[PDB]
Design a binder for this molecule. Structure first.
Ligand SMILES: Nc1ncnc2c1ncn2[C@@H]1O[C@H](COP(=O)(O)OP(=O)(O)CP(=O)(O)O)[C@@H](O)[C@H]1O
Ligand SMILES: [Mg+2]
Ligand code: NA
Length: 393
């Protein structure tokens, strides 16, 4: 865990000695920070670090913890370099999406001290909407975060190669194992076959790059962290119009609309319309998200950690190949007001032909009072949408 430097023979710049042992999330967080402090005291110019890993392993929450610890660093999200015209698919996992010409040019400019125009990618329209000016930050630390941040085209220009594995990406594999395990099967052999089925590109394209990491962070998933800081939801059948929300709520609430499509998946086996733990595939603005449906009902609230990570549609085919079945499809159209801390929205679901109001957030007192501000008392429905269609048979 001791970070030490060694002069890389190809240049005069020093480099971190590879830590062969995988590291904890909290310990890897401190190993990365101290490695940057040492690399910035022994090498001049830009300190570029590649942060690679699968979707869901925790590299996003890793970055936003480094940013809150050090606001003087800049984070570059590698998916902003995507070019939808390169592939005919919409799979974000596809390594053929990144425009390496713009990427490599951006890092050569930042190495020469120049500010560069880094692209901004809108997944809803699947196009590059514009650019943002990124100067070399004060810390001179730039984090390139992406699934292929340790690709062969980027390793010569990286000063530190960090990989993040595990998280909810691996927890889904253990969850599927809990659902489909048969007696006599060696668990490590089934785990391997689950990963090949549900993540058909991890072993081939993603993992080989992660082995070349100098700090290998293994993020062990915590099932109890979600319910420590969960999402509190109040659902109402009242007809609070979006015009009434705009006026009642503060001007800090930003207004937006969206259409989502939820696919509810049941595990294989005979759940007699009960003991049913759903997996939810959500489609929203060009992204597919897998969600775990772990719910507690404290009237009038409904509470859930809302554990979710981005997945390819291929994951749906893999789950169904492993016995998971589609219970129902829920198509909705939503009108959202977002305080960035509290969300007040109205959802219209086609299958119910009804309109519901939803106040959600991580601060339970903030959710209750905002719902009281809209006069929602006496109209609460403490049930999930999938539970409402079940009740209205
Ligand atoms: N050790 C852990 N304990 C609890 N939750 C964890 C976890 N590691 C990862 N997660 C969960 O993983 C989810 C998504 O991971 P995160 O966004 O942090 O990294 P990521 O970039 O790989 C996913 P995405 O690509 O969709 O952004 C979050 O809901 C987070 O709570
Ligand atoms: Mg539901
Ligand atoms: Na069995």
């Amino acid at each position: 865990d001791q970070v030490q430097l060694i002069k890389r023979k190809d240049s005069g710049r020093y480099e971190i000695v590879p830590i062969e042992d995988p590291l904890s999330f909290e310990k890897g967080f401190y190993a990365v920070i101290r490695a940057c402090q040492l690399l910035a005291q022994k090498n001049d110019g830009l300190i570029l670090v590649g942060l690679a890993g699968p979707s869901g392993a925790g590299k996003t929450i890793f970055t936003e913890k480094i940013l809150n610890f050090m606001p003087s660093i800049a984070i570059i999200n590698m998916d902003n370099y995507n070019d939808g015209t390169r592939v005919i698919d919409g799979n974000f996992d596809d390594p053929r999406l990144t425009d390496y010409d713009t990427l490599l040019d951006n890092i050569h400019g930042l190495r020469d001290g120049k500010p560069v125009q880094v692209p901004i990618y809108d997944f809803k329209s699947s196009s590059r909407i514009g650019y943002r000016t990124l100067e070399v930050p004060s810390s001179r630390i730039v984090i390139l975060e992406g699934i292929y941040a340790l690709s062969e085209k980027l390793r010569p220009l990286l000063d530190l190669r960090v990989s993040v594995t595990g998280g909810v990406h691996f927890d889904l594999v253990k969850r599927v194992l809990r659902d489909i395990q048969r007696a006599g099967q060696e668990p490590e052999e089934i785990i391997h076959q689950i990963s090949e089925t549900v993540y058909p590109m991890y072993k081939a394209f993603i993992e080989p790059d992660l082995k070349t990491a100098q700090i290998k962070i293994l993020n062990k998933f915590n099932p109890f962290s979600g319910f420590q800081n969960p999402t509190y939801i109040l659902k109402s059948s009242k007809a609070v119009t979006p015009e009434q929300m705009k006026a009642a709520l503060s001007e800090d609430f930003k207004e937006r609309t969206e259409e989502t499509y939820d696919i509810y998946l049941l595990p294989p086996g005979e759940d007699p319309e009960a003991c049913q733990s759903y997996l939810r595939m959500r489609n929203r603005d060009g992204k597919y998200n897998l969600m775990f449906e772990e719910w507690v009902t404290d009237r009038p609230f409904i509470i859930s950690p809302r554990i979710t990570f981005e997945v390819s549609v291929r994951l749906l085919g893999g789950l169904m190949a492993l016995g998971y079945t589609i219970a129902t499809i829920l198509k909705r159209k939503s009108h959202i007001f977002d305080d960035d801390k509290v969300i007040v929205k109205t959802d219209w679901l086609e299958q119910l032909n009804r309109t519901y109001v939803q106040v959600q957030g991580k601060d339970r007192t903030f959710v209750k009072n905002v719902a009281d501000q809209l006069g929602l008392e006496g109209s609460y429905v403490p049930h999930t949408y999938i539970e409402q269609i079940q009740l209205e048979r």
